[PDB]
From Swiss-Prot, chain A:
It comes from Thermus thermophilus (strain ATCC 27634 / DSM 579 / HB8). The lineage of its organism: Bacteria, Thermotogati, Deinococcota, Deinococci, Thermales. It comes from the Bacteria. Belongs to the RNA polymerase beta' chain family. DNA-dependent RNA polymerase catalyzes the transcription of DNA into RNA using the four ribonucleoside triphosphates as substrates. Signal peptide: none annotated. Mg(2+) binds at D228, D230, D232. This is DNA-directed RNA polymerase subunit beta'. The RNAP catalytic core consists of 2 alpha, 1 beta, 1 beta' and 1 omega subunit. When a sigma factor is associated with the core the holoenzyme is formed, which can initiate transcription.
From Swiss-Prot, chain B:
The N-terminal domain is essential for RNAP assembly and basal transcription, whereas the C-terminal domain is involved in interaction with transcriptional regulators and with upstream promoter elements. It comes from Thermus thermophilus (strain ATCC 27634 / DSM 579 / HB8). Belongs to the RNA polymerase alpha chain family. It comes from the Bacteria. This is DNA-directed RNA polymerase subunit alpha. Homodimer. The RNAP catalytic core consists of 2 alpha, 1 beta, 1 beta' and 1 omega subunit. When a sigma factor is associated with the core the holoenzyme is formed, which can initiate transcription. The gene is rpoA. The chain holds residues 54 to 105 of 315 of the full protein. DNA-dependent RNA polymerase catalyzes the transcription of DNA into RNA using the four ribonucleoside triphosphates as substrates.
From Swiss-Prot, chain C:
Transmembrane segments: none annotated. This is DNA-directed RNA polymerase subunit omega. GO terms for biological process: DNA-templated transcription. The RNAP catalytic core consists of 2 alpha, 1 beta, 1 beta' and 1 omega subunit. When a sigma factor is associated with the core the holoenzyme is formed, which can initiate transcription. It catalyses: RNA(n) + a ribonucleoside 5'-triphosphate = RNA(n+1) + diphosphate. It is an enzyme of class 2 (transferase). Belongs to the RNA polymerase subunit omega family. The gene is rpoZ. SMART domains: RNA_pol_Rpb6. GO terms for molecular function: DNA binding; DNA-directed RNA polymerase activity. The lineage of its organism: Bacteria, Thermotogati, Deinococcota, Deinococci, Thermales. It comes from Thermus thermophilus (strain ATCC 27634 / DSM 579 / HB8). NCBIfam families: rpoZ. The keyword Nucleotidyltransferase applies.
UniProtKB/Swiss-Prot annotation, chain D:
The gene is rpoB. DNA-dependent RNA polymerase catalyzes the transcription of DNA into RNA using the four ribonucleoside triphosphates as substrates. Its EC number is 2.7.7.6. This is DNA-directed RNA polymerase subunit beta. InterPro entries: DNA-dir_RNA_pol_bsu_ext_1_sf, DNA-dir_RNA_pol_bsu_external_1, DNA-dir_RNA_pol_su2, DNA-dir_RNAP_su2_dom, DNA-dir_RNAP_su2_hyb_sf, RNA_pol_bsu_bac, RNA_pol_bsu_CS, RNA_pol_bsu_protrusion. GO terms for cellular component: DNA-directed RNA polymerase complex. It comes from Thermus thermophilus (strain ATCC 27634 / DSM 579 / HB8). It comes from the Bacteria.
Length: 284, 52, 91, 1119, 328, 57, 113
């Protein structure tokens, strides 16, 4: 239940990485291990040479406090970095627990590969099962799909030539955009809003390539999301596997989700302006 | 369509001795009205030299 | 959308069965290639610029268009499952 | 153009210099201009005389006397221009005259010692620290002094607190315990204060005569009469009641530490604590604090009055004499001068301890300058305060108004011991005393709500953070031009009128007059009013005063519009708003953005960058112009000349426009024709539709400059040489790279193009033998060189304008250690209005451009003129911002009358006035219409009949006057343009001032397919190189699993985020055009397993049976 | 409300594709007719009824009386404060009712009144603020000021009144900035405590149920009355019948999911006075080990049909609980 | 026994969710005193390990 | 090849810690500024946590795909990525016992109960 040999984390989990000018930024774990090693070696030397009892007890106390600090900091005093930087050191328990620890970032997958984000503008010309996607960011998002599809044709010989062709926008061709339209014929993408209060904050859509910068959004989902058009942005993700494509297109597509899960009240209801128009046209 | 200056080397510079910036010069040139008298004629290159 | 989703939902008890059926059909189409289809002769999907939906622009729509016919049968255990599930992943 | 003003009020006083707070604070802090002999001592000289005269009586070499005489500073090393070009600090060296004295013979006086360099404030009020310029914002906290607060539990009694500073010092409390105890905790332990009172030399006879005479709670101290007659042994007893374990024979050790200098607050005499003393209680607090050391015994001037007055409150009632914690009269503002002074004196005390030690081990005496004082502590402390402090924050130079507001912003948080971000909900709300001193609307929405604010326009801090509101003296029935400045406490006692009350000039014109008794809206008679408000503008900040029709707007919308005023980018051709408030000229003048004629004279020469003007004195002076200066936030600051050669000017007249000034008027935005009607769906909820007319002529366009920087630094591999040559391949695109490393000016650049050609070493310890031997047999000497060269980041690029190179050959520049050179390249582009951009009015009607329509199909008037911007009415009733409607009506009147209008915020134009103006405008409009011989269109006829059926226009009138009445409503007929048929029912149209808001990468698409991954976890995040991914959080995870989505979440957690082998295999497969493989365990979980393993824990994955299955391939197993 | 009912009925009786097409057509035509119809907001559209004028006079008179009622010592500070609050809160409602009476009588096609009558934008409180008066304004202490706001945004507020309303503006801002945090924490607690519950199940042999009442036990000290239609719908819709019930000559067989029609029929029957409590299945009695059975769970989804076996009810339940919390 | 939502969330048979929720220290200590073989039921655990969710598909 | 079904968490015996780690660290010397390579037996040692380089060993004689598994001629390193330094673990043999802080400071003191 008490520990005799203390494990030492693999170096890459606490790497010393040079920042600039030879200086090295280090994880505090390295400092804690260094202090522990120094205390342990001092204990070994002191016990080897001679035993002044009070001194031996004192150095035992320092070793014990070093181990305790390494396991976690704060429960007994606050061992800190070198004086002048009064930031308490970060220990194992600090890495695990907390509002942003190991648990609250690997539970989360804070980073994804094929993602983008942009401001959103209304897309009234669109049907409900569609959304507008800027051609440049869509081209970037489907890059492997684009490479494969234009390799199906003779636009480029190999993948490296195609990537170098796409690596600069001065080499774009209308054949490239034809291929991009070819890729996304049946594909869907997930549109997402940052505060995801309920199940409808993620919705799949059929992308439509547009010329512009903003994301064109069907107005009827203006209430499914709490998304007005006062400058708020949305993110977009691109599922890869065919199995995931089927999932999104069948049970996440906005055309199939018209009623709340909180109650039978519809959320695809006509919004403010449509209501105004229909009331105007059906009044006596 | 296009503007060339013997002195400057980009759009956001300024000519010494000129009160207006290059931006102002281009904006003023934007309102210049040119009437062609030969319908077959397509592209013309007017020249301007001034001092003092 | 897709041809008659209402008909799709009517002909299965629960939607997740429908999703797994359509996607497993899509995976079968991918692995065997699009030769193992059961709507081949006349009614095939078609692109606009050319006839590209003959081969493989989108397999999910292929599977769903397949399922609207009576040529697809699905069940919890209709075939010895072990044989198929251990030949599927090695090709 | 004319300008018509509507407000009918005489501003007796004009605005004080809107930036005088910081200017006066720093000018009082630094007395360099005044002779050192001058009486002025507060500030830096106060710190010098307070701590610097170190004395040492008997410690080794006794008689150490290091005294202060004078100080001076007069020569900055460099002017600020290159100090921004080169990352220096616009500072001045500091010198001090000191001298050393001993009890023996010897008077070793050193007139000059250099001790640190202190930053010098620029003219506007900013500081340049390391190239960039920052601003130190004021802070607000508790005023030092005496306060009384009710007991937290006991409802009949209360407590008294006297609060000095710093924290590691006194904080004294008096409390009453009913058993007959007058308890007093000095620092941490309570104490019967009667012993200390006896220490003060007070006997019980005068204690009853002067203190216990009135109150019956004197028995709470007169009961303790046993130890009430101990003159001096009470000092020993009191020190004994302390627990240091030390001998009691230390008469003035801790007894006197609350004496003169060390502990008790040195607050400014008269007011900082003395007004908090004398005004609160008693008559006068002579000296700085409570102390006596001329006879060893002690004297008091605080404890006795405080106890007396406390007992008066708890027994009798002098008044409702309990002090509000948040009352503005009990709160004080530490300006930049106070913060700088305090940090300076902390560094000075550090230096004092250092010199104490240096004397301590020093042997001889002829060592005054060198062996005593070292500049490292004080200089480092000042540099740290000006660089890494919380309140010294980056300047917000997006536009002159932004800079002004940032300079006059008051913050509640600060160093940390005062208030923090976690818990402040009690104090975030406004107080009744903010009226006229703090703008109740200026606060920024978000976490820092209510904590950060800005003082009102007419506000003025007098000498110690005590905001004074101007007021006009009212004597009898006459309002005198006399203007007197009240603090909160001073105002809390009189009756104050309101600026809107009817006035006969020098006589009140009303019978029942509104007033504020004590923050209470009451109605009184004119005879009972003593003071009057100068002007309603004194109630709101500078930024809010620019919104024209505040009287018809909601506080939320007014707040958010006032915030958006700050972040409006200056346009290429920006113009003054059609409706102004009247502070535009003051804002552009006081914020030093333009150039003005300092004296009567005539212009001599005016060029694109410099103006030479010969004054009436015969002296000619040259003014240079920052032609295209990059802002802090990336905009462009230009001075455009506004005078011609040989043009007479007046004193203080305009010479050159600022970045956002039309003619001495704050111009940040445009004046456009707006039609308030719902278009198809393009202005759906808050989106905006704009014409292409605003783009065919550049009307919303802005120059944006990006400043790239790349360094060559000395490595152990060897110095990295910035050379035009490219190591391996790229030479075709090198054509734009003309000279050695730096790209040629004026050359357009695309993303992925070289800007600076930098070369590093091929190998860290050994280069590639292939390429090494390559270059060896081509050119004898090898080339151990790898390509690490700055290229345009993916995205966008414009035109290179400037390139600066700083090398080791330093003229006056310094570089980071190990860095041989640095080159900075400026690339500018002309951003044009497009869909992604956003606009806003001054009333907060936030919007985003949704579609640009071609000119033909947008609605147009009966005349050929088409409207510019179409706005959705749905946003008006949901919020409450009717100000924009009034602005639209005024703009409609002005567009035809060709004139501008100035209306004060709470003295604007009455509805009859604007109606009459619209009548004149319609007269002009329809008279011009008839001059060409046209009557009324049939479409207009049917629209009129429909409006008649809707009750808009009275029936029975000819179309002429019916349409005139419709115009009086501000609504005119429009034609759809797409159909030609008119829009059924009238439409409201006018002119609004719409500004383009700040537009960074927020619109730009951080869309990536593959980017840099982190080191600890392989979750992809880039930044400078690549955008990085998007957070998928947990709420998105919860929603994703709320559906039946199972594999989607699996792929998005492993295949696309963490599984390194999984993601590599997936990328290869999709390139190969085959289905993605099944995922594996994410690396974040392996990190978790190893982290748990680091502790004494042990986690392993088990199979269906108790058989561990190793997550790792074989790496966990040994050998 | 009519549009919402129309959409729900179309979804019930037609399905997915036709409902989506109906929504598309409705959106397109609503946009076109909103454009061609030309609804705009002018300053004169915020009409001020003259009747409120004399109302104010009356109220002022009353206040004077109440004020002299204080100067004779008949009232305490608390009594006077409560009287003033009651008087002003009554006259505010009087004025708002007068405003809508004016709008319906005179100008049916007023853009503000039109927007309020439809579900487009606005509330009667906001319209009263625009045209009438925003009388009672809250103090930072949580109480309300004695002196109300006489003017409205059609007119111009006095400086003092604007400073007063700034109190409420700041209160709203801070309350957003903190209650959002609290509600998010609550939602996280919910989603953790419920994440285990997913419907994987056979119909559990639950011979148990819950009896949903139809009458409020106590609105007066002793009185029974039928519950509101909204409560009954939110308690019964999508539930599964515990045991067979026949109330109005109609045999509701045991195990029949309750649609909207069934709930309306039951409400009508209870109005006639035949039954008071409905026995229904519920998760509260489900005997499934981890999760709930299909029957014990119910019928409500994004669809109408009974729930598919295998979808996480716990997480959607927690999200449904937490979502309105941000807007409370 | 009726307890608040927090205590019920904490005291659960699976330790992964409890450790992930409120206080990792106490939860991990308790689950380390006695070997808690966490069964992979409940969605949070399967998300943590990255395996396929029991719910949904 | 088997699927993960359960996750067991338990205490670690001292012999467990010895079995996990590959060698012991004695020097508190991370890395010298001059020698960018790992310094000593310290917290970043090469042969205690695996090679820091990509694929080559210290010398590189027996490295190639015909004979990667054959023990190196002048060396003893099996071909592997840097990922070994992500997973290979160290240990410290304290001359004196110590207690895990959790079991002594948790609100229910496991040692204390
Ligand atoms: Mg928004
Ligand atoms: Zn059940």
């Amino acid at each position: 239940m008490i520990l005799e040999a203390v494990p030492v984390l693999p170096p890459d989990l606490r790497p010393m990485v040079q920042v600039d000018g030879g200086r090295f930024a280090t994880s505090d774990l390295n400092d804690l291990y260094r202090r522990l090693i120094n205390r342990n070696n001092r204990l070994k030397k002191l016990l080897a040479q001679g035993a002044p009892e009070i001194i031996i007890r004192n150095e035992k106390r320092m070793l014990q406090e070093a181990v305790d600090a390494l396991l976690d900091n704060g429960r007994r005093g606050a061992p800190v970095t070198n004086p002048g930087s009064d930031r308490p050191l970060r220990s194992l328990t600090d890495i695990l627990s907390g509002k942003q620890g190991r648990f609250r970032q690997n539970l989360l997958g804070k980073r994804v590969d094929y993602s983008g984000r942009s401001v959103i503008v209304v897309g009234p010309q669109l049907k409900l099962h569609q959304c507008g996607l800027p051609k440049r960011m869509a081209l970037e998002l489907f890059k492997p799909f684009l490479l494969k599809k234009m390799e199906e044709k003779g636009i480029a010989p190999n993948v490296k030539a195609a990537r170098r062709m796409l690596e600069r926008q001065r080499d774009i061709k209308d054949e490239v955009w034809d291929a991009l339209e070819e890729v996304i014929h049946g594909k869907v993408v997930l549109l997402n809003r940052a505060p995801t209060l309920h199940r409808l904050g993620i919705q799949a859509f059929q992308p439509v390539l547009v010329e512009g910068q903003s994301i064109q959004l069907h107005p009827l989902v203006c209430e499914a999301f709490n998304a007005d058009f006062d400058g708020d942005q949305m993110a977009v993700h691109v599922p890869l596997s065919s199995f995931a494509q089927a999932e999104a297109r069948i049970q996440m597509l906005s055309a199939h989700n018209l009623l709340s899960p909180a109650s039978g009240e519809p959320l695809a209801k006509p919004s403010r302006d449509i209501i105004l128009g229909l009331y105007y046209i059906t009044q006596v | 369509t296009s503007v060339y200056i013997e002195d400057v080397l980009h759009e956001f510079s300024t000519i010494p001795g000129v009160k207006e910036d290059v931006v102002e010069i281009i904006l003023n040139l934007k309102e210049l009205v040119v009437r062609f008298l030969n319908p077959s004629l397509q592209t013309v290159t007017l020249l301007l030299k001034a001092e003092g | 959308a897709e041809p008659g989703i209402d008909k799709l939902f009517g002909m299965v008890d629960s939607k997740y069965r429908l999703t797994v059926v359509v996607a497993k059909r899509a995976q079968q189409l991918l692995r065997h290639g699009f030769k193992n289809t059961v709507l081949e002769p006349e009614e095939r999907p078609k692109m606009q610029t050319l006839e590209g939906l003959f081969d493989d622009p989108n397999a999910v729509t292929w599977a769903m268009k397949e399922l609207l016919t009576g040529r697809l049968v699905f069940g919890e255990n209709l075939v010895p499952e072990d044989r198929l599930q251990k030949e599927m992943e090695r090709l | 153009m004319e300008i018509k003003r509507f407000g009918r009020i005489r501003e007796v006083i004009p605005l004080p210099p809107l930036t005088e707070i910081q200017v006066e604070s720093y000018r009082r802090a630094l007395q360099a201009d005044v002779p050192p002999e001058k009486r002025e001592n507060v500030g830096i000289q106060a710190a010098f005389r307070e701590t610097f005269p170190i004395e040492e009586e008997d410690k080794g070499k006794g008689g150490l006397v290091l005294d202060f005489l004078e100080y001076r500073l007069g020569e900055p090393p460099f002017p600020q221009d290159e100090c921004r070009e080169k990352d220096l600090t616009y500072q001045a060296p500091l010198y001090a005259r000191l001298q050393l004295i001993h009890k023996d013979t010897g008077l070793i006086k050193e007139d000059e010692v250099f001790l640190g360099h202190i930053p010098l404030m620029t003219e506007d009020g900013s500081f340049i620290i390391n190239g960039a310029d920052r601003v130190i914002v004021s802070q607000i906290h508790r005023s030092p002094g005496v306060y009384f607060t009710p007991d937290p539990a006991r409802p009949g009694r209360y407590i008294a607190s006297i609060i000095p500073l710093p924290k590691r010092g006194p904080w004294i409390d008096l409390e009453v315990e009913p058993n007959g105890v007058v308890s007093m905790k000095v620092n941490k332990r309570k104490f019967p204060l009667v012993l200390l009172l006896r220490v003060l030399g007070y006997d019980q006879e005068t204690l009853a005569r002067e203190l216990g005479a009135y109150g019956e709670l004197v028995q709470g101290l007169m009961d303790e009469s046993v130890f009430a007659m101990r003159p001096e042994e009470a000092l020993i007893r009191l020190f004994t009641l302390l627990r240091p374990g030390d001998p009691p024979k230390r008469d003035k050790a801790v007894a006197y530490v609350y004496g003169l200098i060390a502990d008790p607050r040195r607050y400014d005499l008269g007011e900082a604590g003395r007004y908090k003393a004398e005004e609160k209680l008693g008559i006068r607090l002579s000296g700085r604090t409570l102390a006596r050391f001329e006879d060893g015994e002690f004297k008091d001037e605080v404890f006795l009055p405080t106890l007396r007055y406390l007992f008066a409150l708890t027994a009798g009632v002098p008044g409702h004499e309990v002090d509000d914690i948040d009352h503005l009269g009990n709160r004080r503002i530490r300006t930049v001068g106070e913060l700088m002074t305090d940090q300076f004196r902390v560094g000075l005390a550090r230096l004092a301890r250092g010199v104490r030690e240096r004397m301590l081990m020093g042997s001889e005496d002829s060592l005054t300058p060198a062996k005593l004082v070292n500049s490292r502590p004080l200089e480092a402390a000042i540099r740290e305060f000006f660089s890494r402090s919380q309140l010294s924050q980056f300047k917000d130079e997006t536009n002159p108004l932004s800079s002004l507001r940032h300079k006059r912003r008051i913050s509640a948080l600060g160093p940390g011991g005062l208030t923090r971000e976690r818990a402040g909900f009690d104090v975030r709300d406004v107080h009744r005393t903010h009226y006229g001193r703090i703008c109740p609307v200026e606060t920024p929405e978000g976490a820092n709500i209510g904590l950060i604010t800005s003082l009102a326009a007419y506000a003025r801090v007098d000498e110690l953070g005590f905001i004074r509101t101007p007021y006009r003296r009212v004597v009898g029935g006459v309002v005198t031009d006399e203007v007197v400045y009240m603090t909160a406490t001073e105002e809390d006692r009189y009756t104050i009128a309101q600026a809107n009350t009817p006035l006969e000039g020098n006589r009140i014109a009303a019978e029942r007059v509104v007033a504020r008794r004590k923050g209470e809206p009451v109605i009184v008679s004119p005879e009972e009013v003593e003071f009057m408000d100068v002007s309603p503008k004194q109630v709101f900040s500078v930024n809010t005063n620019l919104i024209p029709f505040l009287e018809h707007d909601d506080a939320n919308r007014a707040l958010m519009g006032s915030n958006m005023q700050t972040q409006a980018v200056p346009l290429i051709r920006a113009q003054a708003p059609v409706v102004m408030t009247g502070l535009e000229e003051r804002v552009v003048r006081d914020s030093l953005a333009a150039l003005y004629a300092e004296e009567d004279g005539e212009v001599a020469k005016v060029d694109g960058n410099r103006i030479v003007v010969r004054y009436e004195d015969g002296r000619l002076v040259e003014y240079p112009l920052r032609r295209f200066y990059r802002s802090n936030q990336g905009t462009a600051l230009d001075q455009r000349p506004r005078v011609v050669v040989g043009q007479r000017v007046r004193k203080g007249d305009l010479l050159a426009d600022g970045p956002a000034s039309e003619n001495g008027f704050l111009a940040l935005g445009q004046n456009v024709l707006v039609a308030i009607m719902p278009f198809d769906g393009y202005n759906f909820e808050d989106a905006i539709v704009i014409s292409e007319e605003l783009l065919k002529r550049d009307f919303y366009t802005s120059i944006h400059i990006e400043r790239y920087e790349i360094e060559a630094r000395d490595t152990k591999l060897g110095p990295e040489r910035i050379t035009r040559d490219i190591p391996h391949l790229s030479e075709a695109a090198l054509r734009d790279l003309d000279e050695e490393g730096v790209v040629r000016i004026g050359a357009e650049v695309k993303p992925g193009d070289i800007l600076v050609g930098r070369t590093s070493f091929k190998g860290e310890s050994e280069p590639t033998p292939e390429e090494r031997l390559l270059r060896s047999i081509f050119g004898e000497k090898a080339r151990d060189v790898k390509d690490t060269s700055l290229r345009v980041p993916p995205g966008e690029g414009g035109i290179v304008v400037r390139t600066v190179r700083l090398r080791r050959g330093d003229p006056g520049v310094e570089l980071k250690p190990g860095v041989r050179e640095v080159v900075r390249v400026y690339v500018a582009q002309k951003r044009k209005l497009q869909v992604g951009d956003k606009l806003a009015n001054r009333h907060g009607n936030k919007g985003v451009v949704a579609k640009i329509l071609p000119v033909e199909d947008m609605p147009h008037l009966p005349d050929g003129t088409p409207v510019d911007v179409i706005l959705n009415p749905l946003g008006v009733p949901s919020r409450m911002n009717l100000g924009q409607i009034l602005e639209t009506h005024l703009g409609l009147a002005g567009y035809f009358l060709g004139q501008r209008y100035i209306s004060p915020i709470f003295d604007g134009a009455k509805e009859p006035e604007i109606k009459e103006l619209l009548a004149q405008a319609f007269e002009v409009y329809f008279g011009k219409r008839k001059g060409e011989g046209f009557g009324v269109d049939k479409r207009e006829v049917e629209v009129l009949r429909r409006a008649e059926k809707l009750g808009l226009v009275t029936p029975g009138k000819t179309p002429e006057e019916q349409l005139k009445e419709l115009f009086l409503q501000g609504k005119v007929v429009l034609y759809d343009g797409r159909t030609g048929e008119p829009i059924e029912g009238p439409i409201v149209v006018g002119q609004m001032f719409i500004m383009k808001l700040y537009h960074m990468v927020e619109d730009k698409m951080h869309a990536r397919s593959t980017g840099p991954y982190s080191l600890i976890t392989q979750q992809p995040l880039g930044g400078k190189a690549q955008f990085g991914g998007q957070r998928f959080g947990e709420m998105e995870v919860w929603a994703l699993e709320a559906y039946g989505a199972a594999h989607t979440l699996q792929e998005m957690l492993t295949l696309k985020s963490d599984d390194i082998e999984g993601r590599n295999a997936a990328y290869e497969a999709i390139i190969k055009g085959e289905d993605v493989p099944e995922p594996s365990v994410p690396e974040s979980f392996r990190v978790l397993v190893k982290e748990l393993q680091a502790l004494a824990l042990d986690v392993q994955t088990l199979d269906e049976k108790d058989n561990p299955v190793d997550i790792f391939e074989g790496l966990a197993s040994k050998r | 409300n009519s549009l919402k009912d129309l959409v729900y009925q179309a979804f019930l009786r037609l399905g997915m594709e036709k409902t989506a097409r109906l929504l598309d057509a409705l959106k397109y035509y609503g946009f076109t007719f909103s454009t061609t119809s030309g609804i705009t907001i002018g300053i004169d559209d915020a009409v001020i009824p003259e009747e409120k004028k004399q109302y104010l006079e009356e109220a002022d008179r009353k206040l004077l009386q109440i004020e002299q009622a204080y100067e004779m010592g008949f009232l305490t500070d608390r009594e006077r404060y409560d009287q003033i609050l009651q008087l002003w809160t009554e006259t505010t409602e009087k004025v708002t009712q007068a405003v809508f009476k004016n709008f319906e009588e005179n100008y049916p096609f007023n853009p503000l009144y039109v927007m309020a009558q439809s579900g487009a934008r606005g509330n009667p409180q906001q319209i009263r603020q625009l045209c009438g008066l925003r009388g009672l304004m809250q103090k930072p202490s949580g109480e309300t000021f004695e002196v109300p706001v006489r003017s409205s945004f059609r007119e111009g507020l006095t400086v003092l009144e604007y400073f007063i309303s700034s109190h409420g503006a700041r209160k709203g801002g801070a309350d957003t900035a903190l209650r959002t945090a609290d509600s998010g924490y609550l939602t996280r607690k919910l989603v953790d405590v419920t994440h285990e519950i997913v419907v994987r199940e056979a119909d559990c042999g639950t011979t148990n149920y819950i009896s949903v009442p139809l009458f409020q036990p106590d609105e007066v000290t002793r009185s029974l009355r039928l519950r509101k239609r909204a409560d009954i719908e939110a308690g019964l819709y999508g539930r599964v019948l515990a045991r067979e019930v026949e109330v109005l000559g109609v045999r509701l067989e045991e195990g029949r999911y309750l649609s909207m029609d069934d709930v309306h029929l039951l409400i009508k029957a209870a109005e006639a006075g035949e039954i008071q409590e409905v026995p229904v299945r519920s998760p509260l009695t489900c005997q499934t080990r981890y999760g709930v059975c299909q029957k014990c769970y119910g019928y409500d989804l994004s669809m109408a049909r009974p729930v598919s076996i295998g979808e996480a009810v716990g997480i959607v339940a927690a999200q449904s609980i937490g979502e309105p919390g941000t807007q409370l | 026994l009726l307890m608040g939502v927090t205590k019920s969330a904490l005291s659960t048979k699976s330790w992964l969710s409890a450790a992930s929720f409120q206080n990792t220290t106490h939860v991990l200590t308790e689950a380390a005193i006695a070997g808690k073989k966490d069964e992979l039921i409940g969605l949070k655990e399967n998300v943590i390990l990255g395996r396929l969710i029991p719910a949904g598909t | 090849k088997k699927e993960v079904r359960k996750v067991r968490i338990a205490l670690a015996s001292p012999e467990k810690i010895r079995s996990w780690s590959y060698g012991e660290v004695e020097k508190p010397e991370t890395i010298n500024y001059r020698t960018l390579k790992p310094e000593r037996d310290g917290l970043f040692d090469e042969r205690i946590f695996g090679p820091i380089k990509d694929y080559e060993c210290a010398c590189g004689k027996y490295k190639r795909q015909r004979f990667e598994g054959k023990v190196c001629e002048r060396c003893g390193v099996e071909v592997t990525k840097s990922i070994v330094r992500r997973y290979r673990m160290g240990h410290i043999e304290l001359a004196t016992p110590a207690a895990h802080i959790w079991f002594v400071k948790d609100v229910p003191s496991k040692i204390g109960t």
